[model samples]
Structures are given as C-alpha cells and as structure tokens.
Target chain A: LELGTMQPSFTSVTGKGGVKVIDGSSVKFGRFDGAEPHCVGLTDLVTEQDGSSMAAGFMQWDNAFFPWTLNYDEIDMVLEGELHVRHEGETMIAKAGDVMFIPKGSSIEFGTPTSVRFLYVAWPANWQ
Target chain B: GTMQPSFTSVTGKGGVKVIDGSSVKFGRFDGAEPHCVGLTDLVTEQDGSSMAAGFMQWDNAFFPWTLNYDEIDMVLEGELHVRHEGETMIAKAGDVMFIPKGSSIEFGTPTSVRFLYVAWPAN
Candidate 1:
C-alpha cells in the first residue's frame, strides 16, 4: 500500500462503543471562536459541543500572551516548542512532552515567546 | 530511548502542576512484572484538577488492566493497542483513545510506546 494513498496521515477512528483515536500528526486547527487570529488556533477532539465526555483540543500559539481566568480545570500537554503559564507572581515553562494543569478559579497568562502546539484537556465541556 | 523522571510544578507548593514523560517515574506493575508495563500518575486529586493525568508506557507487551474510571490517552511514541473481547484497535503517535469507565480491557503493544493519559475522579 502506498504510504500516501493507503494510509491516512491524520486519521480519526471513532470506533463503536464510544472509543476513539484522534491522530495528531496531521490534525487540522481553526481559529478559536471569539479569539484573536494569527495568535492562536484550536482543534476540538471531545467536548460537550460534540456531546462527549469532558473536552479536549489541539491548541497552537505564536508570539502571544493571553490573560484570563479559568472557570474549569485544564491540562495541557506540549507537543512542540514551549508553553508558558504566568500565574500570579510566578511563571512556568513546559517544553515538548511536558504537561501543565491550571486549576479553576485561578488567573493565568498563556504565553509563548515563539511558537508552540499542544493538546489541552478541560474538565466539564461547559463551565458554569 | 533514554529518559529520567523530573518535575517542576508551576506552583511552589508542589501539588500536581507540571510533569513531562521524562519528569515522572514509571512504576512496574507486579501483576505484569515479566512483561513490560509501567504507569506514572503526574496529576492527582491532591491538586484542584478533580481529575488525574499522567504517563503510561509499554514495551513489546500485553496486559489487561481493568478500568474503574474514564480515561483518555494520547500516544506520544510508537503505537498503543486496545483489545477487548473480539475487538482490537491501534493508536499511533499523535493519536488518542477514550475508554469509558467500567471497561474490562487488555492493553498491548507490538513495540515500545509512551502516552499521556487523563482520567476523571482522580483517586
């Protein structure tokens, strides 16, 4: 089988019984709704929006810094580059393969000096 | 493939904040001792996550670890195999899988695999 024709570079196998596989190698991303363009991009895997358990997505950022407060808990696994989280008086750096979680009710600044791509999972698809 | 466990939590208090595949240790399961199956929990109920996240690795292995909570895994290296009854599926690097709670499943691999996983009701 030809690599390009026989295999899918980015495959999403949503199997029976609610099991799924989201291949990130070629996952596509779109601008987050109500978010600034050219700074961040997102691709949702599982979420309330999709009528699924919890919420997960692929996020990308380039030379951007965002300040906001989280209403739900979040976990980010860096795929490439670095992820910077500025929480209050401290800031943390997470490189590829690294994971970071920001609890709800906390203020944080999502930042990136260059460019980065990561997978983020949030508890409660919709935070109220 | 060489790695050493290390951790640097964003919070100075250190209650589950940050971890990488390299920063966490993988403990061998006595049940699957002869075969290679390891797990490491990076985030637990200790913090405010209300959920748990961590890393799991397998090396040319096969094992069944029953599930009590829902889990989502993203493969970081090689491939992951999920076998249940008469069904089997594979997840390659950059791929993910979601296993519902109450699942009696056996996880296997044709080769070494490392993946990140998140589970609900961290305990």
Candidate 2:
C-alpha cells in the first residue's frame, strides 16, 4: 500500500510574501518566509467540501522569542514532544499524544523546549 | 453535530511538540482570526472515514493554492470552480476532487463554496 502522497504549491500573496503549500496524506505543511507566529493559511480540509475532514501539520520555531497563543474548540491530540504551555495562571507541560479539549477561547502561551516542533489537527468543520 | 469517534491517539512518535487553541481581535475586523484558530490536537484515522473537515467561504478572485501532499476532497454543498495544474473543472455537490502534491493550480468560487477535505503527508 502507498504510505501517503506529497505535493508542493507556491503561493503569491503580495506584501505578505510567498508560501510553499504542502498537502499530504494525514498532514499539511505551510512554509512561508513572511509568516508571523500567528499567520494563518487556508487548509484543504473543509466541512462542506469533498476532501479531508481535518487539517494536521507541524510548526517549526526558528527563534525562541515569539510565543504561540491559541485556543481550539475541537479535540487536540499531540503526536510527539513537549512544549511549555501557560494557561490561566498555570503552566502545564504537554507531551506527545496527549488528547485534550481547550474550549473556544483560552489564554495560553507556547514556549519551545529545546527548539519546538508539533503536529496539530482540526476536525468536524468547527464553524458558526 | 459532535460525535465520538473510534481511533488511537498517538503522541511522541513524530517530531510534534505542542498544540493549543487561540484567537485574535483587531478591533473592527478582529473576526478574521477565525482563519487562524488552533486545532484540536487529537486526530483519528478511520478505516474509511474522512480525516479533516471545515466550512470555508471564498468570494470572487480567490487564490489558487496547493499543498505538498495528496488531497481527496468531495464537494458536499454549494459549488466550486477549481483548476488543477492546467485542467479546470466546475464542481458541485457529490463531486470528488483529487489534487496531487506538487501540482500548480488555481481555484475560485463565484459565490461561496463549502466542502470536505482529506490529506496525507508525503514521504
């Protein structure tokens, strides 16, 4: 059986620079030079469309200064490694494969422990 | 609308580190942050179930983008006009769209198009 597929697409977003869009089986990777820690890209996964019903990928931290602040409504499963997460005045150390539900809006900070990397996914088309 | 699924949640296998949820507010148009919400970290791989799903709305003059993986998509509702590499097709409900990784393409939905998507990493 074929393990998975791979494809790389180039994006032109003018002032926001360019992006290399990587869509594969079980994952999606977006590499852009102009991406802020908070930069968002549209994934091929959608609810009302015909394709994958989810989006999963990793974030590579080049520098340790910027913090990833986010909250997701769907269930999250971390596949590997650990990162320092500060939530509601508490610091929780999340390791690989840990499943958790983080409400809609949660105040948190992600600090890379020994240069961070992670795989994340969103499911069920969380839309209002 | 939320249903419990059957799948194993694996961690620390790949090089993944952290996952979290977040939002952004920029006063008047802060709602745009929906485009960047954190995803639920747990992912399921069903025998024949789709992996990822979402509701996306893109008007006229949208960007034609691609990823570094193969995507199997089906149009559930509305309609979409997609150009894969050099081929163009108008897709509506009940249509399955296959996109190969490394193919250059463009897509646009005159009105609003919604669909389901599945993808896998390339080796």
Candidate 3:
C-alpha cells in the first residue's frame, strides 16, 4: 500500500497479466519493439539509466500459492509451480519452468506444492 | 503491528544492518566462519545448500579484487579494495572483509562497492 505511491497495475486474474509496481523515473528499455510472449508493460520506467532503480515484471499462473513478501532482489521465472523454496535451513524444490536466482539477503519461506506461476524482476520499491 | 508471533529480547550490535534493496537469508555455510568478500551474490542456492543475501551499491571503484570464492564482504559504499599476496587494504563505507576460500585477492574500487554476501556451502 506504501511504495512512494505504488503505481503499476494489473489486478490479478492469472496469465496475461503483469506489472505490479514501477516508477524508476519512467522506464524505457527500448522504446518498445514487440516480440517474445510480448507483454511490454513498464518499458523500464523511463531511461535515465546509470545506476539505481530498476524493474521488470511478468507473471501468469493457475494459482494455488503466492502469498508474497520477501523483500527484494528476485530474478525469478517459474512459469508454473511445483516450487517449494524454504529458507533458514535451506530448501529448493523447483519445477514447472525453473530459472531461480533469489539473492539479496536471505531468510525466505515460500510454497506451491503444485499449482504455481512466475516471472518477476525487481528493484527499489522498498524491495517488497 | 497486527500480526502474531511473540518473544522478544535482544541487545548489542547483533550484526547485520542496512538493507534498502533488502534480501537477508543466512543459512548454508552462512558466512562460513567469517572470511570476507562482501558475501557473494548475497547467497541463495537451493537443494545443494547455500543461502545468504544482502546488497548495497553506490560510489564505485574496484579492481584486482579476488576471493577465490569463500564469501563475506562488507563495505556499504564510498571506498573498497583489499588486495592480498603482498598487502593493500582501504575499506571505507563501514569496512569489513574476510574473503577466504582460495585466498588470492585483489579489489580496488576507489569508491562504490556496497557489499554483503554469503553463499558457500557446496561441496
């Protein structure tokens, strides 16, 4: 509810939906060319790039778990879940489409025994 | 605070602070006894064992910095570089280094190298 002002919407009905928050100046990763699954949401929040502030989003799933809250630095891409990654003792059970890289601080506990969805690139929104 | 989970009592530095980009999970080899290089990608590797994350970046300058692997580095910003084999250490922005996995270091980032890493528990 609080992320400067939190702007970047796409309700959440599952697939064909993405972008949660972005304002990294305005975004502009390439003007917008088209291709790939082709969703094109924020664009990079305006290109004044140099360092600091970054964002990218895309998520689709049938759903069963995705409660949320980890704090930031997530390079995820599961596209579907069987992913059960717990923290504190360490646990990594991923499937569906695996492409994980959740490194920032640590201490996490997530679940998705079966149904799941993914695609999340993050930065700065307080990293939540 | 409308959540549930009790028990509180802590005193002293307790270590670990400053997190804007946030990501703090310490397990697997967790800091490996302590030998620095700003930790390492903040540590996060499942199943095989490894978990740790903490990051900060600003005011940059770094060169010849090496840690072979064994991670744990801290220098929040403004200065960093701790070369070994001969000698050279100048860590600002909080300052703290351990880097001991292979031990062949080199890092000189005049300014900027916010750090924290700990992901080395894969044998």
Q: Per-model C-alpha lDDT, please?
A: 0.75, 0.39, 0.38
TM-score of chain A of each: 0.82, 0.48, 0.25
- TM-scores for candidates 1 onward, in order: 0.86, 0.33, 0.25
Predicted complex 3: DockQ: 0.02
- By lDDT, the best candidate is 1
Listed in order, the DockQ scores are: 0.45, 0.04, 0.02
Docking class of 3: incorrect
Q: What is the per-residue lDDT of model 1 for residues A9-121, given as tens digits with 9 covering 90 to 100?
A: 34577656556777677676666543453346677777664444568878876788877677888888998899888776577888998888888777777889998889888
Which residue runs does candidate 1 get wrong by more than 4 Å? A1-11, A49-52, B1-16, B31-34
> Ten consecutive residues with minimal summed lDDT in candidate 3 chain B?
B7-16
Q: After aligning candidate 2 to the native by TM-score, how far in Å is the CA of A98 from where it should be?
A: 2.9
Ranking by TM-score: 1, 2, 3
The residue-level lDDT of candidate 2 at B5 comes to 23
In candidate 2, position B37 carries an lDDT of: 17
lDDT of 1 by residue, B1-123 (tens): 333443545553423276755656777656766775777778878776777888888789988778887788888899998876558878888887877777788788988899988987676
Of candidate 2 chain B, the 10-residue stretch with the lowest lDDT total is B21-30
Off by over 4 Å in 2: A1-28, A31-54, A62-71, A123-128, B1-123
lDDT tens per residue, model 3, A7-124: 4433211111111122222322331123223322222321113122333344432223322344555544444445555654455654543345554555555556545544344443
iRMS values in order, in angstroms? 2.5, 13.7, 17.9
